């Protein structure tokens, strides 16, 4: 139930030792990402926050594709990984929806964070952004969103 292995914590189920080398590599990259690399730019400092939100997404895609896509881990192991915070319960809960298949993160769909009542622009399909910029005669000006540096979470691309 915590992240820390306490004595209240339950021992892991059977299939955990097969997937543990893949989850350790996500765990040591998150330790190297929080390392306080001192950078004077605001353009570079959030780009280091962007690397953590990518690793949180990729660690949860791995547990999502083990259980829901390929059915490679049991339900008791998958419930253990949620209770031990290995996987994001509410971000996986969006990947199951139809419009939110490749969802960038839970923050990029919050209608209250934005100044409009809108999602992040990385939710918008790229072919839609190419079309509106084609009428203006310019290239599309979006590269990476400010929340976690996504480049398009739309399910179609």
């Amino acid at each position: 139930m915590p992240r820390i292995k306490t004595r209240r914590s339950k021992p892991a189920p059977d299939g955990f030792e097969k997937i543990k080398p893949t989850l350790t590599d996500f765990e040591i990259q998150l330790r190297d990402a929080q390392k306080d690399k001192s950078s004077k730019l605001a353009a570079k400092s959030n780009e280091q926050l962007w690397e953590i939100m990518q690793l949180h997404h990729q660690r949860s895609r791995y547990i999502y594709t083990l259980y829901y896509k390929r059915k490679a881990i049991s339900k008791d192991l998958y419930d253990w990984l949620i209770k031990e915070k290995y996987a994001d319960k509410l971000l996986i809960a969006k990947w199951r929806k139809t419009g939110y298949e490749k969802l960038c993160c839970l923050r990029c769909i919050q209608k209250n964070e934005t100044n409009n009542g809108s999602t992040c622009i990385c939710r918008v399909p790229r072919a839609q952004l190419e079309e509106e910029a084609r009428k203006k005669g310019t290239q599309v000006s979006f590269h990476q969103c400010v929340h976690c540096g996504c480049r398009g979470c739309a399910s179609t691309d």
Partner: peptide
């Protein structure tokens, strides 16, 4: 039109305070 708060990772807070 209210979705609840988004539940950030623990390391996202942790990087900010280190920075």
């Amino acid at each position: 039109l209210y979705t609840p708060k988004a539940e950030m990772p623990p390391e996202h807070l942790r990087k900010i305070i280190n920075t």
